[PDB]
Amino acid sequence: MKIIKLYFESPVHFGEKRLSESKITFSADTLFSALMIEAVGLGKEDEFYQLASNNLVKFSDAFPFIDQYYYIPKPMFNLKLEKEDENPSKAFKKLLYVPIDSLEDYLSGGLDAYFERESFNLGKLALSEKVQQHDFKDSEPYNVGTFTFKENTGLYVLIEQTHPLLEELLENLQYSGIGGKRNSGYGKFKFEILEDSDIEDLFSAKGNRKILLSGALPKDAELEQALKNASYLLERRGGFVQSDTYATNLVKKQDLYVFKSGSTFENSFDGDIYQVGKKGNHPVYKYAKSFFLEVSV
Template identity: 30%
Template sequence: LMDAGRDGAPMQYYLYTLCFDAPVHFGAAERGGGLEHTQMTLTADALFSAMAAELSAAGEQDALQDLLAAVRDGRMRFSDLLPWREESSGDWDFYVPRPAFWEQMNHSLPDSYASACALSRARKQQKKTAYIRASRLQDFSAAVCAGRPFEEVNDFGEEILRQRVNCRGEEPLPYFVGSFAFHEQAGLYLVLAIDDADTDGSEHVEAMACLLDFIGQTGIGGKRSSGYGKFHLADDPIILSDDAVYGEDDGALYQMLSDTAAEWQMAIAPVLPGVQDIEAAAHGLYRLRHVGGFVTTAALAEKKNGVCLLDSGSCLRERIAGSMAVLGQNEGHPVLRYGYGLYLGIREG
């Protein structure tokens, strides 16, 4: 593990909205990791790896070192790429992961068969809801506590399964590639946190916009050679504040990002606890995700070390900084895995 950076420093938050010009193929390890499987969102650790790889391939070593220094020092944090959609009214809805504590919050037993059936239906409906509007997260918490059903629209696009043919062998063999195509009025967004005391904060904000523009032209995720993953920024980044700009959700995001005193702190980026974080992490409710795999070069594929991350939606009692992991070496350079947390404060009931 590498240094954990600073924790608890006042941060300024910025929001970037991404519109996709092509379907995306984001690996879905929890569904087997095959080409036929995909997921809709991209984790912050995968995004960091994509940004670092593109900067390195472009020979932008100064920009890469600036990015590494900013995250290592705790001057910069960012979220997963999470879904947004535009309403017919013109308001933009920003969604966050379903909290991991949702199954633990209601400990009361049903008093009748009918109430038991209603509770079961409510839990099944809530389990299907992977993402919740930021402005409705407290309503979701209250509904779970009371055992009430909670419905949320999770319509951002559609999964597509296309057949391809591998002609490299003696016989052509079919295979399938899964992808996700966003609706025209939907996409993904990124929250960037910059340390208020960082004198280069505005430069980091502009640099992130330039970097997103750059990788949007080449695409992110898998199957980029087939044109997948290309996007553009819908607008300039906005400063999150109490004053909502897009609708209710950006204001709600700011309130929860700033709420360090709430009973639960939900991660919206994967967290790799450092040694100093283990005790605090032990008191949380979380989802684990294993990352590892291979480092592939022109000569060979070498297995990387693996680590388990506390995935987005994990809920802790306090905000821990997290850390950066070194999973191996590639051509003399360390293979890094981003594991610094970014949190939303959620109050029970």
């Protein structure tokens, strides 16, 4: 709809649980936390939170794009029911991201499992080796897991019905970085809003299968109906609260288990902005709203 294309000119560190590892993408709660921190910095966190909770701004999580090829995580479809020939989900196991336009080819088979993998070539991971220099003690080494994007490669976020506030926070987020060691030399990108009409065709279409495009958690009143002919994967979201005015000490937020952003559902749900920090001075939010791409299955 309004694809936020991210062009990174520095290696990124998106940690899953450890500083020594990096993942190639970042989630929607990570982007929401970054934008909320920017809004706190410029003093309208409440306006941004109301925009996000009232669905004025709702965004997927970051996906790879490689030379105007927008990719989507391989959806967890209840297919492979073709029980005669081929290799459904056999060679479709090392394939992590499928092109968003080639999704109909993947649905009915014919997508080349091998060719879709060497075609998918975005940068490469690295380990940065560092120390804390101590003038008289022994210097303690530590290392940071990083990912470097390629020349015509980056990440993109699906935003529908963009907002002036979202564009203003995205401009400020350029000069603060995104990811782990952004105050060191790791969070650095340029962004475009780049309205697209090919992608709008996919998201204006209806279907019997809803591909979840962001880490989402249905509310308790709808989790039961969401779990009906669903093919999902449950992911833990947590970590330490990143703020200056919370608890006067480093404290981990509550662990939130959400549906991973490749899950497919037949019943649509709209998640929630969950408060995973309640004992501190300010609320801590975990964006778990549902972004859906509908297909025919």
